Design a protein around this nucleic acid. Structure first.
Ligand SMILES: O=P(O)(O)O[C@H]1[C@H](OP(=O)(O)O)[C@H](OP(=O)(O)O)[C@H](OP(=O)(O)O)[C@@H](OP(=O)(O)O)[C@H]1OP(=O)(O)O
Ligand SMILES: O=P(O)(O)O[C@H]1[C@H](OP(=O)(O)O)[C@H](OP(=O)(O)O)[C@H](OP(=O)(O)O)[C@@H](OP(=O)(O)O)[C@H]1OP(=O)(O)O
Ligand SMILES: [Zn+2]
Ligand SMILES: [Zn+2]
Ligand SMILES: [Zn+2]
Ligand SMILES: [Zn+2]
Lengths: 384, 355
RNA sequence: GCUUUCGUUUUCCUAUUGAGCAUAGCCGCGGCUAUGCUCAAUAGGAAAACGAACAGU
């Protein structure tokens, strides 16, 4: 099953970039999101991302003209958001049966179908909490019929909240670092910190894959499976994405309001590993692709968060673009009240998601993990 | 021009540190031909917490670079005014003012400011997106111009628990109310700046709004209301031609450094977290409000002014009706333009009697 | 001891400008056109070795 998913992703990517320059043959982390219409359906790759770089501290934009992280699975979810936006433009009364959404209780917001299953394929494991192991301890693949998760908590430093920092390799925890995120502080030379990968999947599961922007229109979309081409671990990943939150009993889950409930998807490894993995050859290119694009494999610069080339125009997976798509959806959905408001105010306007996020940070702090280190408030709130 | 200012400031810093990062400095120029000499110098990017507050004003609060440099310059001005006498008025930079009651600085002498980076607050609100003489600010979003308060454990600010105002705001307060401090308006006319040199960041519209031109956004109705001899100063804004192109994202030193012309080689170190001298003995800071009050009392005793020897620090500060009116009008004008409310500390901190 | 940014050395290619040597051609002893090699300056792309960025697994 996982072998089919990996072959699907690799085939789509290779058939897309067959006629491009050879300079794309270097080391790259390839991450895709594949949809399955039903159990018997073969499945089609619905979102493709590459790139392993983040903007520099000076490169940050007060008008949202950068992609803060160009990472493989992060770009994969940005393309997934673009796919969801495109589908919501496609979604209507006539194509409801073919579409991938069905209205929830009251019809205010939609949810994915139960047959339609989402599977996040990644070449390697997500950075941060999901990478607490060693290469020589990479466990093999077994076929378990049960859906029961077995997370591991052997050390108190496992499960904390971590951040990836510019110029700084690895993932650094969210300690009680009293440096409040401030814009001009960063400009004068304070490091920029970004929420890590697995720490940004805990949210996708406790809160939603759609982010806080998209929860105004659809119910939280949950991963149905995570397939890893490399660095797969059962307990570590299962803790990192779904059950680090509920280590201390159901008191965390029961407090969380519907529909923002925890969810333990199925995890898996590709049937046959890929032999080639060299430490070097890492390139600044980032390939972004959505299913609605066609044959355009957009190329970006991760050191600067913009399109590769001397022109270096605006990309399409950036906060400005995603907010333009937000405005397009609002115009399509007649969301006039939210159509004339700002960015951070729009993120906070999701009362349910905001309260769920606050409960998330409160519980993460109570279990001795950490708060939710964020960007400066004037960077997460801008106008166009 | 501005490259000369930067080189002079940096060589003076090196000269002070030969016997032994952000920087602000104030230099004096007797004339165009003269090279110029430093009078104030400071560093630092820290502010005290909410637990080290002093009811008697024994601890310095705002430990940033520009503010401590201004302080130090105030101490130099106290020493320079004390050195005045009728025998050596010609060689001194002071001359009697109108009415003969108060001194003033000479017309040829000018004061310039160099800041190694854009000041915090409204001075670094721009992303990557000396021929002139007119000031042209930029007003793009309502966020620009809002008063900001320093945060604890950080270089940045937050828009408007102990709270201190941002560096750019304070350098607006100087330009409006002069550099002469609070207790020296009895005997001294206000002293202003002439130029500003931002050696590592620069915007021809952002700094002029940060320091000078934001009190002129809604017209010239703020200068006329202010009473003479208090006027808004517009220093000439410049950037060093060749700058350090490389940005350090690592940790920095929190200790502030200060020096003034009258000190000589007595470089002083402070810790911004607490507000005391760097040392296990927990020494009293020589630039604290206590020392300023003591020097003011010494100046009144020397000048045979027994009138102000009875009053306390707060009473002496409010005794000058013109200056307090100028302050109150400045704060009201900042409030009126929708830039926020100047967070004034309670009067109990500065209302103490020496024992 | 594995896990983004700075640089140093070497190699290769493309583009622009200038000089030296040799060959073929033409015009009124002189001058001009084309080709091969060497050097000097700048821009872009690729690879190898080494060094530092801070900080947590
Ligand atoms: O870019 P992403 O990795 O997809 O996540 C970004 C952003 O993180 P970045 O630092 O990378 O920009 C925010 O994460 P933090 O600021 O907390 O670190 C978060 O928004 P919040 O700050 O409100 O949590 C999230 O938003 P969402 O919840 O919708 O997924 C989303 O923001 P964008 O939609 O602007 O990309
Ligand atoms: O010593 P500084 O850092 O340069 O600032 C202090 C103080 O500011 P902070 O308490 O924030 O550090 C006062 O500002 P407020 O807090 O009261 O708003 C104000 O003196 P006032 O109490 O009279 O306002 C000011 O300037 P000034 O020279 O006019 O006094 C000066 O006070 P000191 O000169 O006593 O240090
Ligand atoms: Zn990552
Ligand atoms: Zn689980
Ligand atoms: Zn500052
Ligand atoms: Zn001005």
């Amino acid at each position: 099953f996982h072998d089919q998913i990996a072959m699907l992703s690799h085939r789509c990517f290779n058939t897309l970039t067959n006629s491009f320059q050879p300079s794309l043959l270097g080391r790259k982390i390839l991450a895709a999101i594949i949809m399955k219409k039903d159990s018997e359906d073969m499945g089609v790759v619905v979102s493709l991302g590459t790139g392993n770089r983040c903007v520099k501290g000076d490169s940050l934009s007060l008008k949202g003209e950068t992609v803060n992280d160009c990472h493989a699975e992060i770009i994969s979810r940005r393309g997934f958001i673009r796919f969801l936006y495109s589908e919501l433009m496609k979604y209507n009364s006539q194509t409801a049966k073919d579409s991938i959404f069905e209205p929830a209780k009251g019809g205010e917001k939609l949810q994915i179908k139960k047959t339609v299953s989402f599977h996040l394929y990644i070449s390697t494991a997500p950075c941060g909490d999901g990478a607490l192991f060693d290469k020589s301890c990479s466990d093999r693949a077994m076929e378990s019929t049960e859906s029961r998760h077995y997370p591991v908590f052997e050390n108190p430093k496992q499960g904390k909240l971590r951040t990836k920092v510019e110029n700084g390799e690895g993932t650094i925890p969210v300690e009680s670092s009293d440096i409040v995120p401030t814009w001009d502080g960063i400009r004068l030379g304070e490091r920029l910190r970004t929420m890590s990968c697995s720490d940004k999947i805990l949210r996708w599961n406790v809160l939603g894959l759609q982010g806080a922007l998209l929860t105004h229109f659809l119910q939280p979309i949950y991963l149905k499976s995570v397939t890893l081409g490399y660095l797969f671990s059962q307990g570590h990943l299962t803790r990192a994405i779904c059950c680090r939150v509920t280590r201390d009993g159901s008191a965390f889950e029961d407090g969380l309001r519907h529909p923002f409930i925890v969810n333990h998807p199925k995890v898996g490894r590709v049937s046959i590993y890929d032999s080639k993995r060299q430490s070097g050859k890492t390139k600044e290119t980032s390939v972004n692709w959505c299913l609605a694009d066609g044959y355009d494999l957009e190329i970006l610069d991760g050191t600067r968060g913009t399109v590769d080339g001397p022109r270096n125009e605006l990309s399409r997976v950036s906060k400005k673009n995603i907010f333009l798509l937000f405005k397009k959806l609002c115009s399509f959905r007649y969301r006039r009240d939210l159509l004339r408001l700002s960015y951070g105010e729009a993120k906070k306007a999701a009362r349910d998601y905001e309260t769920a996020k606050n409960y998330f940070k409160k519980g993460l702090k109570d279990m001795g993990y950490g708060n939710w280190i964020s960007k400066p408030q004037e960077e997460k709130n801008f106008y166009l």
